[model samples]
Target: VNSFSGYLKLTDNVYIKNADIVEEAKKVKPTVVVNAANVYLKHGGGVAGALNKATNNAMQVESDDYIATNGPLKVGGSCVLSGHNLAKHCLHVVGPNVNKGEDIQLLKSAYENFNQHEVLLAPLLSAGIFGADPIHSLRVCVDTVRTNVYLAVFDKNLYDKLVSSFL
Candidate 1:
């Protein structure tokens, strides 16, 4: 694990890592996988896209039906349901747009929604499409789901370097 960013213990059972998300998913076999999305629950990019493709878009179909019945989801709101691809469950959060001062709040709410779960596998929520700062997003996620959650980042070296500079 030396080649990867060191595991950060945010809480007793929660950890943050800057490693391959897919690889971490395989190793952890988490009870749930958290996927960030827009109000429409479209699995278009980043972690959601990967998961959608992996599950052959089964998750998206479920999300689509949810959105179709109930209007668009508000920022910070989410839908939790069973997953067909990786884990037993999937959490879909409606992250905020790339606007000023909304990133942290949006990311925080996403993790907050996971409070009901005991274990989770999450990525740097809203970091890519929503343009949230990756480190800040990770921190908010840690702050919200401080127990029994694994936050996975894509590039370990990059994340390690960034954290080193900040620390």
Candidate 2:
């Protein structure tokens, strides 16, 4: 509550906020905290890495089990993990590589797939390690989720960038 600077309404339900992803996620306690991951379920970097640590590596075990049984998730594919450390659930999304510049659709598809949930806490998909454009990725997130979507901005620079981009 006190950590986030403010929020900008993206739709009737979706709101983008400038706050720490993990911190905001704990506060909101949403149905799921989305983690942008590769098909192999590598949780070594970026949001996935943070989630792995935050969940005390519980998320990682689930992710490995999923990949081992289901094969690698296609780009835009996702699955949910229950009993997560932070939120009740965690949605692992296989986001598109930034090299392809197709993350917008992939991210939208990820959100659409998880639309059954009442609330979701997500980060800038593919915008960090994947090198996708933050503005475009966020736009897709805002436009796709039918329920509540709270974007977690961890850095002041990213917050300013988002504000300027939206403006």
Candidate 3:
């Protein structure tokens, strides 16, 4: 309904690299880097905030223009914009906010619904501010194998835990 940043901090549980969104965006160089976003498509915080800052607010302009032209996106919908100074393109997908009774399926839908890109760099969808269980969210990504995908985990411990879960 509106822009919000009161995202609950993730409970301690799971990383391999000490990476954040922007650094991975630069490193991965995917066809499009994913933004876990708001329905209004505003780059409030989380991935959006970092990417917007690094890209010099170019995403903000493109996001605004896209929204103005197309209107608000649904919780499970997506929109693509030129990555500008960063990745070749950016996919702004509104993942479900579990605090608002949004579910794992909605998060899956966010991942499932995106424009075709050869490589997709995704930070785990809905695991942070949106309140989706981080572990379960990863399962969703695993279950929905759709593209050449790489994850950008921002913490060392969590990343290690995630790797432990896999091997």
Candidate 4:
């Protein structure tokens, strides 16, 4: 469903690949896709916006409902929402704004905190507008994707930068 160039097999099941997060979300069809979302979970831009539109705006309704009941998600926290409308569930994780002091730990939790899933689709958590450094963000992802998960990495630039880091 998706294509790639450079890659590294982080583990037997985990690997970093040059791919599109939205494309793979539609193509690879994982158990759940993680959103590097803001605390509001508004899906206005970046990965959240991309996935919100990909799901045909159905997620916007659920996100509003989720907030209405539970209040905004705490930074470093997450909750799973319906895939009812893929690649069957979407995990919305609130990432720390880079402006904060505790961003590293919180950002790490963005990738680490989640329900058990055999397959996980995730972006460079907080690396975009949320303001985390892409390199630092990638490293957090590399370090946190451990213990129990098949994590997939998208973004050709991320893959390219990653390769330079190693090879």
Query: Scored by CA lDDT, what does every candidate get?
Result: 0.71, 0.75, 0.72, 0.70
Q: If scored against the real structure, what TM-score would every candidate get?
A: 0.81, 0.86, 0.83, 0.83
Single out the weakest 10-residue window by summed lDDT for candidate 3.
1-10
lDDT of 3 by residue, 21-90 (tens): 6876676565677888888878878878888999888888888988888899998888887887667888
Tens-digit lDDT track of model 2 for 15-78: 7777777776777676678887788888998888887888888878888888789898878888
> What's the true lDDT of residue 102 in model 1?
67
For residues 102-121, what per-residue lDDT tens digits would candidate 1 score against the true structure?
65565677668878877777
Error of 3 at 27 (Å): 3.5
* TM-score preference between candidates 2 and 4, better one: 2
Compared with the true structure, model 1 gives a TM-score of 0.81
In angstroms, how far off is 97's CA in candidate 3?
Answer: 1.0
In model 2, the Cα lDDT at residue 22 comes to 74
Two-way TM-score contest, 1 vs 4, winner: 4
Let me know the TM-score candidate 3 reaches against the reference structure: 0.83
Q: For residues 1-167, what per-residue lDDT tens digits would candidate 4 score against the true structure?
A: 23332446665444666666787767767667788777777999887887888888888888999889988888888888976434588888887877665556787777777435556767667776777777777667667766334334555666677658742
Question: Considering every candidate listed, which one attains the maximal lDDT?
Answer: 2
- Candidate 1 has its poorest 10 consecutive residues by lDDT at 1-10
